[PDB]
Design goal:
The structure is a homodimer of 483-residue chains.
Chain A: E1 19-22, E2 27-29, E3 37-44, E4 62-70, E5 73-80, H1 84-92, E6 121-125, E7 128-132, E8 139-141, E9 148-151, E10 168-169, E11 176-181, E12 190-196, E13 202-209, E14 220-221, E15 225-230, E16 233-235, H2 237-241, E17 247-249, E18 255-261, E19 272-276, E20 280-281, E21 286-290, E22 293-301, E23 325-332, E24 342-355, E25 367-372, E26 388-393, E27 399-403, E28 408-410, E29 414-417, E30 427-435, E31 440-447, E32 457-460, E33 471-475
Antiparallel strand pairs in A: 1-5, 2-32, 3-4, 3-33, 4-5, 6-7, 7-8, 8-9, 10-11, 11-12, 12-13, 14-15, 15-18, 16-17, 18-19, 20-22, 21-22, 22-23, 23-24, 24-25, 25-26, 26-27, 28-30, 29-30, 30-31, 31-32
The complex binds lignostilbene (2 copies), cobalt (II) ion (CO) (2 copies) and magnesium ion (2 copies).
One magnesium ion (MG) binds next to loops of chain A.
PDB class: oxidoreductase
Keywords: lignostilbene dioxygenase, carotenoid cleavage dioxygenase, non-heme iron oxygenase, bacterial aromatic catabolism, oxidoreductase
Assembly: dimeric
């Protein structure tokens, strides 16, 4: 394959496209013998060169990595998420879909097809592996064989066109809670709220509209509510016609937080929109209720964090204003005005990729993990450099940091509970480490509440993973692997 | 897996064990559209840590790499050669066989099993892929699926215990010509000569004895003769009982060249042994007859080339005396004495891994390729450093060199003929290049008689191959791949 000689395809961003199997990877330390299950993660990875001769990282085809941990060892199985795009381009031997979220650049032969790369999350629910991309229904796969099933439209009960890559699981019911924005077509202001039973059936689909179309990448869920931030990374057909990236950031638009009842009978009038001054937030650590209030914790930045989705008025990217810090947004459903109740920075540590013990989804909670950017650490070989694992204790305020060293960077952590009813945070953290000087990757295993001593086990891969997005652990009994 | 922290298992020698599939590898330059077939090669690669807690490179399990070149692109498929050793240890989840060629160190549960790692050649013949190791019958595999069949004993017609890793194909008949030393048991002085028809049937097996047991790794074949050098890398049960490496080099023993008739009715008395002073030679570029004379071209060194098979009298390894240079050994079957007719150095270039256009096997020939060690080139990051591809023209004497640069090394080349009846050397050379600074490998494609301009195509693998031994190209129609 002849790939472009541009930053998105060279160095750490070289195409990999490895499908492989390796049991009993070389490792150091002690893999806890309690672990019996697998950690799934996804990397964008282009099957074919881009039609345009350049592209962005978020547009690569989804390649799924599974780390099966059992009997004190770690195995890897890596397979493509065989979206309709993947299958059509594989059959044609060339790229047919074009630029990111831009149907105007597709070959006429794929007009009207789902454009999904399934490249943003690898999630486990209802016995299936979900390979997810927010512009289409989710792909599903067999979590044991990692064969692909197809797109999940819930027996025709789903009429929205899209499905999130950030599903939540409500611990009170076991339901998956999801959204789908641009639900009636590209750049529309319609959004769907979905709840899926543990058995994989769509319980309900509720439609509503938002203040303006924008990237609704993540959200929060509480007992009673969908918690939906409205942040002005905006897109338009006009932008696409002019050849611009789909999204661009508008510093002049307000930010909203919508509180949407989790009810099949939802009506537009039941929603409250709270309003604040312009800022940037993408991911949600967790949300929960307290009396008549709703709290949501997000990494907040002063300005845009996506340099490839540039300032719509032509401003150059500002790296310092892109620094995000975990911040609690509080709104009161009994308040008179549309103002936030409070905005409170929870740490001075800069970070992203926030995670929790997911059994606390929607509940008051004590622990949060993040990828941290410590600009004061040496780097002995641009972009965001995520060089630490970070743990925050909301009860005492204590913070823990682990630095991966001067030639490495880190990918998103994932929490593994010790058992169904273990206390919050009783378990382990796994995460990929980019060993940039060795052009390879490790899987690190930490004791989740004691990270400053470093990982208790380091699993070496004999090749490099690419930049990853989101990933999750599932116990073996949830994914058809051995007891 | 917990592997030892020793040189044979770290750095470039880290275990890999990757089984994978990747079509349409990222590449540069122009892959000739004439190419339709595959290049097979093998790397020792340990499935499990060694029982002893250390080992040598030559004892790793055979991992087979196939580069399928077609339609101007290159695909890779890599699979284990599933020897009986591989299968037994896989089932047990641990190493059961011990040190190199040392049955005294095996677990009692595998007493009497073939110890083969099938790690020395990946050869194509009679529609099968041969994964070869000189201490046992050859393994065979499906060249298209790269599944394993098992050990080839030719319907019971083979009674020798061993089969070479350096088979030759006689262009006059299409027969495979092979030997098997230590044919009646470990360290015995019996050798078998085998010829196999193009249909895969054993034509004949002829037994004889050699002057002393030693590593009979390679050999030559002419129209009338097996040409067998006797070089004193010797082994013994006594060495094994004392815990020494199986082989050690004895500088005090003579070197012989045996001329053995290629005949099923062979008798010991039909053999001529020519004798010369001590030296080291392992591989054979080619052998051929001229009147009553036999010529064989080998890389000759003053002393031992295997530091892990040390001098039997305790001398430290001598790197300078291990430098090998292509040398023609000539003997005359009509001569009165046992002296060589001539010993003539053919180049001052130091090199090994000699190859020819294999259609000239056993015939007078013009071209030879080697891996070259140019000690005068910069190395910007011990062992042999093979840093050039080398081509020798026996007709004019001309020499060509291509240097892979200061941070790379090279593996064995293989010649690809343009067509069945193209002139000698009309075709291409393929070879793996170790990109040591990038911790990855390339496959290089050269115009076979014009190498100084560099490869015409460079295929990038997104991971590193390990040290390889021998490999071969086969046209697609010979290995069940598409026309
Ligand atoms: C600062 O917030 C982060 C965001 C992201 C990516 C979001 C994302 C959005 C849309 C996509 O279509 C997509 O597809 C791959 C990805 C990654 C890391 C972060 O820290
Ligand atoms: C200097 O001659 C060379 C020899 C070799 C290896 C021979 C070999 C011998 C016995 C084995 O059992 C084996 O198993 C892996 C390998 C490799 C490169 C060279 O240049
Ligand atoms: Co995300
Ligand atoms: Co050899
Ligand atoms: Mg269904
Ligand atoms: Mg047979």
């Amino acid at each position: 394959a002849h790939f472009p000689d541009t930053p998105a395809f060279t160095g750490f961003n070289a195409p990999s496209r490895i499908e492989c199997d390796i049991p009993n990877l070389v490792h150091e330390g002690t893999i806890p013998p309690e672990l019996n299950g697998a950690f799934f993660r996804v990397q964008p990875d282009p099957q074919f060169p881009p039609r345009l001769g350049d592209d962005i990282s978020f547009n690569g085809d989804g390649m799924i990595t599974r780390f099966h941990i059992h009997d004190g060892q770690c195995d890897i199985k890596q397979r493509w998420a065989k979206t309709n795009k993947w299958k059509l381009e594989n059959a044609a031997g060339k790229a047919l879909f074009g630029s990111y979220r831009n149907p105007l650049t597709d070959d006429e032969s794929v007009k009207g097809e789902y454009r999904s790369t399934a490249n943003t999350n690898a999630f486990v629910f209802a016995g299936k592996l979900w390979a997810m991309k927010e512009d289409s229904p989710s792909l599903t796969m067999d979590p044991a064989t990692m064969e692909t099933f197809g797109f999940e439209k819930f027996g025709g009960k789903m009429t929205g066109q899209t499905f999130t890559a950030h599903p939540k699981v409500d611990p009170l019911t076991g339901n998956m809670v999801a959204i789908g924005y641009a639900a009636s077509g590209l750049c529309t202001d319609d959004v769907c709220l979905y709840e899926i039973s543990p058995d994989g059936e769509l319980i309900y689909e509720a439609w509503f509209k938002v203040p303006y179309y924008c990237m609704m990448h993540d959200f929060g869920v509480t007992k009673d509510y969908l918690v939906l931030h409205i942040v002005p990374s905006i897109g338009s057909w006009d932008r696409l016609e002019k050849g611009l990236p789909h999204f661009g950031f508008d510093t002049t638009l307000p930010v909203y937080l919508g509180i949407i009842p989790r009810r099949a009978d939802l009506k537009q009038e039941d929603i409250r929109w709270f309003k604040r001054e312009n800022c940037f937030a993408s991911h949600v650590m967790n949300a929960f209720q307290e009396g008549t209030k709703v709290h949501v914790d997000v990494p907040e930045a002063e300005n845009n964090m996506f340099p490839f989705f540039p300032d719509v008025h032509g401003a150059p990217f500002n790296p310092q204003q892109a620094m995000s810090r975990l911040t609690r947004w509080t709104v009161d459903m009994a308040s008179n005005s549309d103002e936030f109740d409070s905005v409170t920075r929870l740490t001075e540590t800069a970070g992203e990729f926030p995670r929790i013990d997911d059994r606390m989804t929607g509940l008051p909670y004590r622990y949060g993990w993040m990828l941290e950017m410590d600009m004061k650490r040496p780097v002995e070989l641009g972009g965001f450099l995520m060089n630490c694992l970070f743990l925050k204790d909301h009860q005492t305020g204590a913070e823990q940091h682990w630095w991966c060293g001067p030639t490495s960077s880190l990918q998103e952590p994932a929490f593994i509970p010790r058992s169904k009813d273990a206390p919050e945070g009783d378990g382990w953290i796994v995460q990929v480490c980019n060993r940039l000087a060795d052009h390879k990757s490790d899987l690190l295993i930490f004791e989740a509440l004691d990270i400053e001593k470093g990982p208790v086990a380091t699993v070496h891969l004999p090749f490099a993973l690419r930049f990853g997005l989101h990933g999750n652990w599932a116990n073996a009994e949830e994914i058809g692997l051995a007891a």
